[PDB]
Design a protein around this ligand. Structure first.
Ligand SMILES: Cc1c(C(=O)N[C@H](C)COc2ccccc2)cnc2c(-c3ccc(C(C)C)cc3)cnn12
Ligand SMILES: CC(C)CCC[C@@H](C)[C@H]1CC[C@H]2[C@@H]3CC=C4C[C@@H](O)CC[C@]4(C)[C@H]3CC[C@]12C
Ligand SMILES: O=C(O)c1cccnc1
Lengths: 226, 232, 289, 57, 340
């Protein structure tokens, strides 16, 4: 405040006000949970958004006084390796997949079916170099129609190396095991699974529980105790 | 964009007053604000300044401790509170906005001001000229001289020129003796160095008659020059 | 043995302190010295994080390094049976540093155990995201309440004649009420009541949530019981003996000093446990985590 | 049947691209040298400016 | 079918003829001719200013044309205008889409531009009578993330998107005037000629193209890399440019002779470049690697002449003033640094 003139000491005050605003607006974006939502297209993403409803697509909701912001990127159709590192600090990845489509094969390639496509995409997004400490909340959808679809035609078509009694609760357990057997970290990553079919207030509670567990762990490793 | 002042009027010798200006059309919360007084048939002089954020307040040595500046930011209003009064306080008060960052132009919009009648070290900036008779169509020059150099180490020299037409409020013409304000014709120009500065008009219209003032802004208080008048 | 410094205090100089205290303090000095120097070096050169919870362990690593350098003078004090050759002024620092780095380690040994409690049972709170400029102010105030209750050890002509020698000791079996003794007991009974509550609720509320199936969070439950296990191993044995001193002073007045002849000796061994913390503090807080 | 249209577009682009004139590489290298040498006295970074007039000192 | 095969064969034989024509015009290399001149000494550059205040990863920056002001953009959701000489903040503009990837400063100082991963390019007006900065225009019409935007003049702007397309926009009306197509993969960067009549683009298909602003057609193509083209920039003479790939290699390409001039690479570098710039005299090529630090190359002998190692994370953006006074680098640790 000695060399400066009278029109160089108001610029400093202006800069200080700018700094105050930047710092005060950056304590609001660290008090909210950022979730990244992924799926296989017509795999229940829209209905899961509808159930817990209040380029890139945005959603914002609240439950038990905790601001969730949820990013959907299903309309991009770009090269995934050129923008996937933007979502590096997300709290969790919500992976919605329907298990009422094991028989229905993909339209593009008549040889293979949609469950295999979902498994490939899960393997690709679960072992990426940017997501080695990010948890995956896995939703299994449309289990109503699965009950009537399994009895008419078994799931051996989708899983040739299977041997079972072709019942609902087994088959669901086998599919859950098959999806969590794709994980290759096992020490810095945990997969949460859930069964849902147009049910209310259960999905949000499950998401809240998984988020609370992730937050507790991330807090425990900032003091070394973990 | 507009500012409207209100609060003036005849006052008793010993008393108080409160003048308020309402500013509509811009972002009042990021604009420093000055008051500027002008005596009847004298030059216009400076009073006080309050900054953005209401942090820094500057007064004149004539009114220090007798005037108070305040700012109601949510409702976009500026107040001046006048405590003790004497005969030499009668004037017209104007409220000027000014925003300071690298490359701005303080003293842009001058307001309109309210009358005020009361019953009954520093730089020296001089305009030895008193009046310049002149006919339209020819160039005119006006001179201003300081008491110490206005050129800082950084190279920016803080000389301001501006014009008051008869019956209106003044409007910035030139800032830092070289830069031209936004909304004035390129006929006007300014130059000089050190302590001697000159303003020039190339083509003279019949709308340029008025009075011209040169001011310095090196350090508070800001000292205004005298009145140099032009006739037709 | 009834001498008068300014009160009616028995003073004993037993021919047993020499054979036991010097070696014990030598081990508690040669190990805590580098044990805390290495920690205080890594905390300022090779650590580039400076979160709001590692500026609460730095204070604990500086409040126990200062109670290591102040040991050898008191070591010499015992090897010569309460003989001070270092004059007056050092005899008022070597009782102020010891009594201000021992209160100032229990304060930063309890802030960590409230930090963790908020980090576990109340996740996404407002206090788990404080800035490291409002976590250094609280450090500068905890360093200011440590000093304010300890400066009276500087405003007292400390060295007293013992007939033949000169003794430098803040602790002595006197008969008038003091503030150093109440502050000896209150620096234990309160932090215990905080640490036990916090370390029990962390363990319970990390267990009704079925979170204790991972192999890295079943390890973090041992190091929460260990921390509360080596706090009663260290600070308790020297509090029961002071309670015994209080009871012996109440039952019988300071009229026959022979009664104390044993207990006082015991105290100056039990108090020697307090300095062992500053030796094994960086091993259960910094390296084993 | 738009594959033939796309191929026609591509071959027309190739027709256009093969209708330019080229110079030897040595002339380009010489022009680079000339521009680098005739301006060596104007950039502070290459020839470090004295610390008495640079504004960032 | 038959027409498809015959036209593919025709394209292949055009490729062969063009390769023969390019080979026939090669007789000397840049190294052989430059073997005569003498090297510049090792360059020692010291961090003068440090610019702090961003709370997240910085993705782009641009220098003003007065070489005193600069603008920076980060995933924080803010766009900041600095003052290099004094380290002050002039303006701080909020954003609607926090997923920003570019920024640009107008060559007259009135407007700025921002955009990315939201399909929209926004034009902000800095000099208003109302005292603040407000969105002047909002251009939409792409179907992919914006990866570069450069002001052509005060009322035109050229953008490149992630749907294999560049586009020229008139800011007043708001509608595309010309559309440049021909790239196969995502287009990652573009750079403008000194006379603003041509520009070059570099895409994710390991090829670069020289467009034409007026007639709106491709003129010439440059291949040779093996991965993405993350950054590109013209030589100050306007008759060459430098490409920065993702396989830890930079190259110098020539316009008048469609050839590879010279390659910048070392065996100790296995990580790809993210930013490329020249020097006012065209003697130093500054390259921003993702091994946490920058590099300086003597751009006439292809030998390193200094290292600007002062950053804690990946280096993303880098730029040199209009008079060679300084050089500013930004990085993913949310810091900007000025070297002389
Ligand atoms: C006697 C005494 C003294 C004392 O110093 N006595 C002199 C040594 C001399 O000792 C005596 C003995 C008997 C008679 C006269 C003096 C200090 N503190 C206490 C306490 C106390 C107990 C707990 C707590 C809380 C748990 C944190 C606080 C204070 C209770 N008594 N008490
Ligand atoms: C992370 C934040 C919440 C930590 C705040 C610390 C507060 C809540 C607690 C932690 C431990 C406490 C201290 C523990 C022991 C003593 C010594 C005693 O003779 C006086 C009180 C005093 C000095 C306590 C004051 C309050 C205290 C400092
Ligand atoms: O720790 C103390 O304050 C102490 C230790 C021994 C003797 N006197 C005082």
């Amino acid at each position: 405040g000695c060399t400066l003139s009278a029109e160089d000491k108001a610029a400093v005050e202006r800069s200080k006000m700018i700094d105050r605003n930047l710092r005060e607006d950056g304590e609001k974006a660290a008090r909210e949970v950022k979730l990244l939502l992924l799926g296989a297209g017509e795999s229940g993403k829209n209905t899961i958004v509808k159930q817990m409803k209040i380029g890139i697509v945005e959603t914002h909701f609240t439950f038990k006084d905790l601001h969730f912001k949820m990013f959907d990127v299903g309309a991009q159709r770009s090269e995934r390796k050129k923008w996937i590192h933007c979502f590096e600090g997300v709290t969790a990845i919500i992976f919605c997949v329907a298990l009422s489509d094991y028989d229905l094969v993909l339209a593009e390639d008549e040889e293979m079916n949609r469950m295999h496509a979902s498994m490939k995409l899960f393997d690709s997004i679960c072992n990426n170099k940017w997501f080695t400490d990010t948890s995956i909340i896995l939703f299994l959808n449309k289990k109503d129609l699965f009950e009537e679809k399994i009895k008419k035609s078994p799931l051996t078509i989708c899983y040739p190396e299977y041997a079972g009694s072709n019942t609902y609760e087994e088959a669901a357990a086998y599919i859950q095991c098959q999806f969590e057997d794709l994980n290759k970290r096992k020490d810095t990553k945990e997969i949460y699974t859930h069964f849902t079919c147009s049910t209310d207030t259960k999905n949000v509670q499950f998401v809240f529980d998984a988020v609370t567990d992730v937050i507790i762990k991330n807090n425990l490793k900032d003091c070394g105790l973990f | 964009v507009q500012l409207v002042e209100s609060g003036g009027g005849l006052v008793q010798p010993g008393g108080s007053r409160k003048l308020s200006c309402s500013a509509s059309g811009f972002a009042f919360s990021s604009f420093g604000m000055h008051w500027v007084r002008q005596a009847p048939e004298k030059g216009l002089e400076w009073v006080a300044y309050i900054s953005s954020g209401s942090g820094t307040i500057y007064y004149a040595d004539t009114v220090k401790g007798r005037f108070t500046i305040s700012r109601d930011d949510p409702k976009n209003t500026l107040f001046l509170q006048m405590t003790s009064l004497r005969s030499e306080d009668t004037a017209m008060y104007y409220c000027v906005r000014s925003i300071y960052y690298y490359g701005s132009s303080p003293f842009d919009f001058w307001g309109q001001g309210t009358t005020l009648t009361v019953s009954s070290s520093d730089i020296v900036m001089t305009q030895a000229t008193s009046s310049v008779p002149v006919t339209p169509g020819e160039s005119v020059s006006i001179s201003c001289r300081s008491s110490k150099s206005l050129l800082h180490s950084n190279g920016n020299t803080y000389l301001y020129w501006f014009l008051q037409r008869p019956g209106q409020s003044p409007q910035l013409l030139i800032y830092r003796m070289s830069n031209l304000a936004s909304g004035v014709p390129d006929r006007f120009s300014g130059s000089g160095s050190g302590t001697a500065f000159t303003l020039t008009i190339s083509r003279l219209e019949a709308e340029d008659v008025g009075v011209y003032y040169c001011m310095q802004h090196l350090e508070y208080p800001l000292t205004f020059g005298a009145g140099t008048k032009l006739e037709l | 043995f009834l001498e008068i410094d300014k009160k009616n205090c028995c003073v004993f100089r037993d021919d047993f302190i020499v054979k036991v205290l010097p070696p014990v303090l030598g081990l508690e000095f040669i190990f805590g010295l580098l044990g805390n120097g290495l920690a205080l070096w890594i905390f300022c050169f090779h650590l580039k994080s400076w979160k709001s919870s590692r500026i609460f362990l730095f204070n604990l690593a500086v409040a126990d390094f200062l109670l290591i350098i102040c040991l050898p003078f008191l070591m010499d004090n015992y090897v010569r049976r309460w003989d001070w050759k270092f004059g007056d002024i050092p005899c008022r620092l070597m009782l102020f540093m010891l009594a201000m780095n021992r209160q100032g380690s229990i304060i930063f040994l309890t802030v960590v155990a409230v930090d963790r409690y908020f980090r576990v049972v109340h996740p996404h709170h407002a206090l788990n995201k404080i800035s490291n400029r409002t976590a250094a102010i609280i450090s500068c105030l905890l360093w200011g309440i440590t000093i304010g209750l300890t400066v009276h050890l500087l405003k007292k002509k400390m060295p007293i004649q013992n007939g033949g020698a000169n003794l430098c000791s803040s602790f002595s079996i006197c008969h008038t009420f003091q503030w150093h003794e109440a502050m000896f007991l209150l620096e234990f009974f309160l932090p215990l009541g905080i640490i036990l509550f916090c370390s029990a609720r962390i363990i319970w509320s990390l267990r009704q949530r079925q979170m204790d199936r991972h192999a890295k969070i079943k390890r973090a439950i041992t190091f929460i019981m260990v921390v509360a296990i080596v706090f009663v191993i260290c600070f308790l044995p020297s509090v029961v003996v002071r309670i015994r001193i209080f009871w012996l002073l109440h039952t019988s007045g300071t009229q026959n000093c022979e009664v104390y002849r044993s207990v006082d000796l015991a105290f100056f061994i039990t108090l020697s446990f307090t300095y062992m913390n500053s030796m094994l503090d960086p091993v259960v807080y910094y390296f084993s985590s | 049947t738009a594959s033939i249209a796309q191929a026609r577009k591509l071959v027309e682009q190739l027709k256009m691209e093969a209708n330019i004139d080229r110079i030897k590489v040595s002339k380009a290298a010489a022009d680079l040298m000339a521009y680098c040498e005739a301006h060596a006295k104007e950039d502070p970074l290459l020839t470090p400016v004295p610390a008495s007039e640079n504004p960032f000192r | 079918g038959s027409e498809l095969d015959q036209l593919r064969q025709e394209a292949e034989q055009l490729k062969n003829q063009i390769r023969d024509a390019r080979k026939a015009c090669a007789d000397a290399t840049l190294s052989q001719i430059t073997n005569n001149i003498d090297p510049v000494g090792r360059i020692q550059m010291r961090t003068r200013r440090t610019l702090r205040g961003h709370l997240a990863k910085i993705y782009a920056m641009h220098w003003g044309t007065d070489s005193r002001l600069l603008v920076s953009a980060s995933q924080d959701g803010k766009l900041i205008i600095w003052d290099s000489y004094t380290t002050n903040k002039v303006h701080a503009i909020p954003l609607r889409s926090s997923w920003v990837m570019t920024c640009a400063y107008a060559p007259s100082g009135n407007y700025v531009a921002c955009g990315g991963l939201d399909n929209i390019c926004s034009i902000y007006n800095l000099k208003t009578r109302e005292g603040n900065v407000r969105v002047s225009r909002e251009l939409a019409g792409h179907t992919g993330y914006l990866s570069c935007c450069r002001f052509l003049d005060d009322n035109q702007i050229v953008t490149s998107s992630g749907d294999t397309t560049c586009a020229l926009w008139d800011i007043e009306t708001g509608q595309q005037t010309t559309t440049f197509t021909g790239h196969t993969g995502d287009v990652m960067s573009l750079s403008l000629a000194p006379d603003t009549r041509l520009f070059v683009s570099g895409a994710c298909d390991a090829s670069a193209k020289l467009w034409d602003v007026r007639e709106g057609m491709c003129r010439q193509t440059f291949t040779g890399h093996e991965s993405d083209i993350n950054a590109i920039c013209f030589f100050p003479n306007g008759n060459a440019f430098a490409t920065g790939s993702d396989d830890a290699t930079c190259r110098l390409f020539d316009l008048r002779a469609d050839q590879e001039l010279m390659t910048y690479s070392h065996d100790n570098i296995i990580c790809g470049i993210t930013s490329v710039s020249f020097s006012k005299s065209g003697r130093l090529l500054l390259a921003g690697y993702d091994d946490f630090n920058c590099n300086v190359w003597d751009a006439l002998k292809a030998d390193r002449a200094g290292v600007l190692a002062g950053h804690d994370n990946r280096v993303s953006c880098l730029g040199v003033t209009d008079d060679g006074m300084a050089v500013a680098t930004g990085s993913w640790d949310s810091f900007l640094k000025i070297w002389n």
